[PDB]
Nucleic acid binder design. Structure first.
Ligand SMILES: [Mg+2]
Ligand SMILES: [Mg+2]
Ligand SMILES: [Mg+2]
Ligand SMILES: [Mg+2]
Ligand SMILES: [Mg+2]
Ligand SMILES: [Mg+2]
Ligand SMILES: [Mg+2]
Ligand SMILES: [Mg+2]
Ligand SMILES: [Mg+2]
Ligand SMILES: [Mg+2]
Ligand SMILES: [Mg+2]
Ligand SMILES: [Mg+2]
Ligand SMILES: [Mg+2]
Ligand SMILES: [Mg+2]
Ligand SMILES: [Mg+2]
Ligand SMILES: [Mg+2]
Ligand SMILES: [Mg+2]
Ligand SMILES: [Mg+2]
Ligand SMILES: [Mg+2]
Ligand SMILES: [Mg+2]
Ligand SMILES: [Mg+2]
Ligand SMILES: [Mg+2]
Ligand SMILES: [Mg+2]
Ligand SMILES: [Mg+2]
Ligand SMILES: [Mg+2]
Ligand SMILES: [Mg+2]
Ligand SMILES: [Mg+2]
Ligand SMILES: [Mg+2]
Ligand SMILES: [Mg+2]
Ligand SMILES: [Mg+2]
Ligand SMILES: [Mg+2]
Ligand SMILES: [Mg+2]
Ligand SMILES: [Mg+2]
Ligand SMILES: [Mg+2]
Ligand SMILES: [Mg+2]
Ligand SMILES: [Mg+2]
Ligand SMILES: [Mg+2]
Ligand SMILES: [Mg+2]
Ligand SMILES: [Mg+2]
Ligand SMILES: [Mg+2]
Ligand SMILES: [Mg+2]
Ligand SMILES: [Mg+2]
Ligand SMILES: [Mg+2]
Ligand SMILES: [Mg+2]
Ligand SMILES: [Mg+2]
Ligand SMILES: [Mg+2]
Ligand SMILES: [Mg+2]
Ligand SMILES: [Mg+2]
Ligand SMILES: [Mg+2]
Ligand SMILES: [Mg+2]
Ligand SMILES: [Mg+2]
Ligand SMILES: [Mg+2]
Ligand SMILES: [Mg+2]
Ligand SMILES: [Mg+2]
Ligand SMILES: [Mg+2]
Ligand SMILES: [Mg+2]
Ligand SMILES: [Mg+2]
Ligand SMILES: [Mg+2]
Ligand SMILES: [Mg+2]
Ligand SMILES: [Mg+2]
Ligand SMILES: [Mg+2]
Ligand SMILES: [Mg+2]
Ligand SMILES: [Mg+2]
Ligand SMILES: [Mg+2]
Ligand SMILES: [Mg+2]
Ligand SMILES: [Mg+2]
Ligand SMILES: [Mg+2]
Ligand SMILES: [Mg+2]
Ligand SMILES: [Mg+2]
Ligand SMILES: [Mg+2]
Ligand SMILES: [Mg+2]
Ligand SMILES: [Mg+2]
Ligand SMILES: [Mg+2]
Ligand SMILES: [Mg+2]
Ligand SMILES: [Mg+2]
Ligand SMILES: [Mg+2]
Ligand SMILES: [Mg+2]
Ligand SMILES: [Mg+2]
Ligand SMILES: [Mg+2]
Ligand SMILES: [Mg+2]
Ligand SMILES: [Mg+2]
Ligand SMILES: [Mg+2]
Ligand SMILES: [Mg+2]
Ligand SMILES: [Mg+2]
Ligand SMILES: [Mg+2]
Lengths: 131, 122
RNA sequence: AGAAGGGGGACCGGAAUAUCGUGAACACCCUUGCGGUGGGAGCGGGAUCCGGUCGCAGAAACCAGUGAGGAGCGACUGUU
RNA sequence: GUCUAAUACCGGAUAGGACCACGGGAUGCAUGUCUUGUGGUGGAAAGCGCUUUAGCGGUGUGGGAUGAGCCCGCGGCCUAUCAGCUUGUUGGUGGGGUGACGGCCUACCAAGGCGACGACGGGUAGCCGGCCUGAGAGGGUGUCCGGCCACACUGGGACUGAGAUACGGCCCAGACUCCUACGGGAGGCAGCAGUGGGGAAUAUUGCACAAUGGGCGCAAGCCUGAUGCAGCGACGCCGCGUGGGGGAUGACGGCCUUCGGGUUGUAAACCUCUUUCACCAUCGACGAAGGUCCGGGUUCUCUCGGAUUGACGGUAGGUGGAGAAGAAGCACCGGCCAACUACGUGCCAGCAGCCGCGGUAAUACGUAGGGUGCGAGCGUUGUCCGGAAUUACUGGGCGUAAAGAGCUCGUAGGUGGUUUGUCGCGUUGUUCGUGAAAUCUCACGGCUUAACUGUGAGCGUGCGGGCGAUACGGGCAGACUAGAGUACUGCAGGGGAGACUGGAAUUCCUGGUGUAGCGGUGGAAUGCGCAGAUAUCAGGAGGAACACCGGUGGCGAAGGCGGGUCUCUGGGCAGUAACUGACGCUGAGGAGCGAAAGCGUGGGGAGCGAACAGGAUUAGAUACCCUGGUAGUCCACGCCGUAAACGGUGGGUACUAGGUGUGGGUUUCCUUCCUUGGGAUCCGUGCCGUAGCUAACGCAUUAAGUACCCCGCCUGGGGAGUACGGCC
RNA sequence: CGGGCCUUGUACACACCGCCCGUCACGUCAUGAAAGUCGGUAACACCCGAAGCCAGUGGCCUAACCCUCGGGAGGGAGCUGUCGAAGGUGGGAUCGGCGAUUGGGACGAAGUCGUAACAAGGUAGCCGUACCGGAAGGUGCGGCUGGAUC
């Protein structure tokens, strides 16, 4: 069945980014909203917002592309898995593309990326690498 | 595959077969060296090869190659045998070191003169 | 298959007044009977445990399976 | 048999850290802990010497320090071809016993405890900081050092003492060697050596207690095979030499040669210079603000300052003398791999790791020359890691290369939609403590540098306590309908089972006709018929399969499923949103279903048809072809449990151009222009194709794409899906 | 009969005078089974049981105290039972060795019999199963295309 909507969301992102889709729609969960917030303020997508779905909430996000048809995301990868959870301390955080990409980190301070985790001093769950 | 599968049954390495036997962790081992004779190699490389049936001190029996030319080995020479397998012959997997108790060094050896057993000169 | 192979076995005492299980009387209670509730006397039975005692020997005499393994033939009980 | 003591032994008096009972006062974590009081009981000892302030003791106890005992969480091999292990076992009570809790032991009572997270069993093994390898994770290993454990000829047990595997203690049994006067006794090198024996293989029956640690004595002092050393083994690591600067007519010799020369080659001869190491001679240690004696010290202490004490050892080290003088070998040269020509040999000798070389011209065998790499080392073996992403966590795969279980259900387990609040177990932050020393890394310091050492800083990834957090995971208390399921209305279907039943056709029988062929083949023959066959007509018996519909289709989990009717019955799809509210997914084991063949029992048996037989073909023909033809094929009920059981593609879920068929629903527009056209949507089922993927073939919304969850499976080919064991 | 062009199938590439299967015969090696036989290991049941601890008995010995001076008190020697290693008996379990005889496997050589597969491999081939055959194989039933035909 439907396991790990985090990976479902990022796989929807991959498939539509590879298909050059302007926008994606999916179910809304607070974790998805915060992941889309991270993706925004790290600059991998354009605006996202929410519909009044028939049930629940519906999360739509827009995919930004360069002036020509170049992907603004070069890929992405779920790292924390429901079959294998991966945790990282603040001193041994993952380095995505040596730094040119980022990793979504879940911490007691909420969801926040590699730079905030390193210079704020707490590590924890590593949901995914976007780059 | 499905990491739960790995934790239920872990990765186990393939059995590494013992490359050398009859010596049981011994770099060399001596034998009474019965039945010296000459045998033929496989379908290519038709020649005649000097081999010996060695009763090793592991209380085993193996077939060994006599390197070099010439040997004084007949039936009961106390030989020292080490590894090394010849490609031509099927059952040969061991080699008597030349220059041991009752294996003299090969005569007229002036090149490489440590294999095959040889003092320099007089 | 009672496979095989082992162990215990006598007597006395104690446990033992209801030890236990069998059979169920005097005198008390209730639809009046070859009736019922309890009650436990004496009378027998069996088993165990502990202690002691005796002999060469406790199944005591009489009585009362030898067992195991491999073949052939016939399946078998039977019949001649 | 006499005789004699003691800090040996015994008897006493007093003494609280014994006890009991009753109580206080503090604290908890329950059995409980400490400080006390009252009362009644109790238990200890010792002396030894003196230059006349030489000194050694002892006993009762409170608290430290140290060592130890025990218990527990976590971690650390193979194996299910080990699934049932446990009776003092699990617990309790009263006891005993112990230093101490404790089935540690015992009487009684109950019948519990462990285990698929691997009990019990089998095999292997001392464990560790570490060491080897590797980029790391890992893999191998546990040798020096250090820590822990176990053992001491084999097996069993107690004693003293604070403290016992009591290696050089005791008791017994057993095995082995020795003495005996045969009654009896002694011994335990896995301590330091050393011997024999096994192996390929690892050493002196040395010195000192100089230092330190330890034992004892007020002390000097004695003991210490601990320890410091020393000898031997290139056994390993590091360091240093075996000359240097010039030196062409580029010398002789060697090798090759295209016969002009090249090469060894500044390498040599020669000149000139300096002696690291070895030689002789000599002085000569630090390790000792040390260990004792004698001057002075106010006594404890301290030196003015004098004697004497080092196994190493006349060793390390400094200086003088002499002259290149005493000092290089090993391996390899086809590719990996750095390094080539000649001669001798001619599938022979032989080489080799691999693939290959050598059969008359060998860069690959032997020798020579040259060269390369090293160098007191160089090679061979063996072992391990690496390369090997060839067990893949990092870091692999399963359509055809090895790999999807035949299919489904379901147990444990794994995993799990959206949302609210809480706990804070995981997770995460910080601090404290621990993570010994040594090892590894950084920085200095010294042994002449180095190896080696020391110091300071990291490492010690982990664990325990406290104080934070709640984003994610997890527990709890809830909520929602989106997943899942139910209800209702419809819908399609060879889904299944049972009973009855229909017609064609084949075969056989009865009769009618009718005569000489029929049958069969590539061609024949066997065979059938002339006793009336084949053919044809009518009737009848029986069995099996169900033409046309029929398809590329439908249904079923798969295997599979169609003549018709009736009876019973399963699933699926659509729509409403009525209901439940995550109840889901997968699924180790397990269970069920599972083509055909086959097996059992009982029926049935038309046709077909393994076997069989004949004929033919053929060299043969155990076949293909023909003629017959048994089992079987069919039925009922069991068993079997396998197939190219295939889409050679496990299940679930989400997303990612389209184009075109076909099957089952729903729904909107010309709606009565009927057209049963056009569009949307759900579920199938095919074809073609984009992105993407693929070794390619190809797959491609029904994925072999992009992802997640769970399971099954693979680790070169054979041996072999075999043997052995076990289950059926 | 030979040759050319296109397509198809191929396990051939020395290229069909290709490749290749299986018995049988010869040689070597590893290995299974086997009447039996030789060992090892760990238990278990019972018997006998040392020392030794523990639990009982104790006439023989007796220095520490009392005393009525007779003795007594307290202790010792000696004797029995429980447990107990070894040993003995027994039946099993389990791990090995050998074994007449026998079975397959692998590798070898220029052997013998065929030609089963690869082309439509000359009867398409394979899968399961059954039966048969010197041997590859053949045949039946069902299945697959990893074959064909319209
Ligand atoms: Mg009997
Ligand atoms: Mg009695
Ligand atoms: Mg008795
Ligand atoms: Mg008697
Ligand atoms: Mg009879
Ligand atoms: Mg009878
Ligand atoms: Mg006296
Ligand atoms: Mg006294
Ligand atoms: Mg007193
Ligand atoms: Mg003293
Ligand atoms: Mg008991
Ligand atoms: Mg108790
Ligand atoms: Mg107690
Ligand atoms: Mg061992
Ligand atoms: Mg690596
Ligand atoms: Mg050790
Ligand atoms: Mg050692
Ligand atoms: Mg010994
Ligand atoms: Mg004691
Ligand atoms: Mg000794
Ligand atoms: Mg020694
Ligand atoms: Mg030796
Ligand atoms: Mg000393
Ligand atoms: Mg030494
Ligand atoms: Mg040396
Ligand atoms: Mg050596
Ligand atoms: Mg060096
Ligand atoms: Mg000098
Ligand atoms: Mg090279
Ligand atoms: Mg030549
Ligand atoms: Mg050579
Ligand atoms: Mg090697
Ligand atoms: Mg690896
Ligand atoms: Mg290797
Ligand atoms: Mg692979
Ligand atoms: Mg897959
Ligand atoms: Mg395959
Ligand atoms: Mg399948
Ligand atoms: Mg299901
Ligand atoms: Mg399931
Ligand atoms: Mg479950
Ligand atoms: Mg769960
Ligand atoms: Mg969740
Ligand atoms: Mg320095
Ligand atoms: Mg330094
Ligand atoms: Mg250091
Ligand atoms: Mg440390
Ligand atoms: Mg729904
Ligand atoms: Mg039906
Ligand atoms: Mg008819
Ligand atoms: Mg008939
Ligand atoms: Mg007729
Ligand atoms: Mg007729
Ligand atoms: Mg509700
Ligand atoms: Mg299963
Ligand atoms: Mg079935
Ligand atoms: Mg059948
Ligand atoms: Mg049948
Ligand atoms: Mg049969
Ligand atoms: Mg029948
Ligand atoms: Mg036929
Ligand atoms: Mg025939
Ligand atoms: Mg039926
Ligand atoms: Mg199968
Ligand atoms: Mg099928
Ligand atoms: Mg398969
Ligand atoms: Mg899938
Ligand atoms: Mg479709
Ligand atoms: Mg396509
Ligand atoms: Mg693929
Ligand atoms: Mg293999
Ligand atoms: Mg089998
Ligand atoms: Mg079997
Ligand atoms: Mg032409
Ligand atoms: Mg043979
Ligand atoms: Mg055997
Ligand atoms: Mg006794
Ligand atoms: Mg034999
Ligand atoms: Mg053929
Ligand atoms: Mg064939
Ligand atoms: Mg033919
Ligand atoms: Mg054929
Ligand atoms: Mg077949
Ligand atoms: Mg046949
Ligand atoms: Mg067929």
């Amino acid at each position: 069945t439907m396991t790990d909507p985090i990976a479902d969301f990022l796989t929807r992102l991959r498939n539509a980014n590879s298909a050059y889709h302007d926008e994606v729609s999916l179910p809304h969960s607070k974790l998805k909203a915060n992941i889309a917030q991270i993706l925004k303020n790290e600059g991998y997508i354009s605006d996202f917002r929410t519909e009044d779905a028939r049930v629940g909430k519906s999360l739509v996000i827009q995919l930004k592309y360069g002036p020509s048809r170049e992907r603004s995301i070069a890929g992405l990868r779920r790292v924390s898995k429901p079959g294998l959870r991966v945790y990282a301390k603040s001193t041994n955080l993952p380095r995505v593309l040596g730094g040119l990409g980022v990793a979504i980190i879940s911490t007691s301070s909420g969801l926040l990326t590699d730079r905030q985790a390193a210079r704020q001093g707490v590590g924890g769950e590593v949901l995914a690498y976007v780059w | 595959p499905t990491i739960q599968q790995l934790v239920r049954k872990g990765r186990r390495d393939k059995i590494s077969k013992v490359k050398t036997a009859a010596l049981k962790g011994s770099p060399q081992r001596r034998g009474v060296c019965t039945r010296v004779y000459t045998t033929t190699p496989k379908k290519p490389n038709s020649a005649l090869r000097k081999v010996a049936r060695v009763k090793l001190t592991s209380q085993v029996e193996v077939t060994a190659y006599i390197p070099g030319e010439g040997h004084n080995l007949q039936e009961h020479s106390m030989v020292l045998v080490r590894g090394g397998r010849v490609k031509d012959l099927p059952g040969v997997r061991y080699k008597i070191i030349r220059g041991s108790l009752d294996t003299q060094g090969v005569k007229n050896r002036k090149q490489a003169r440590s294999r095959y057993g040889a003092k320099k000169e007089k």
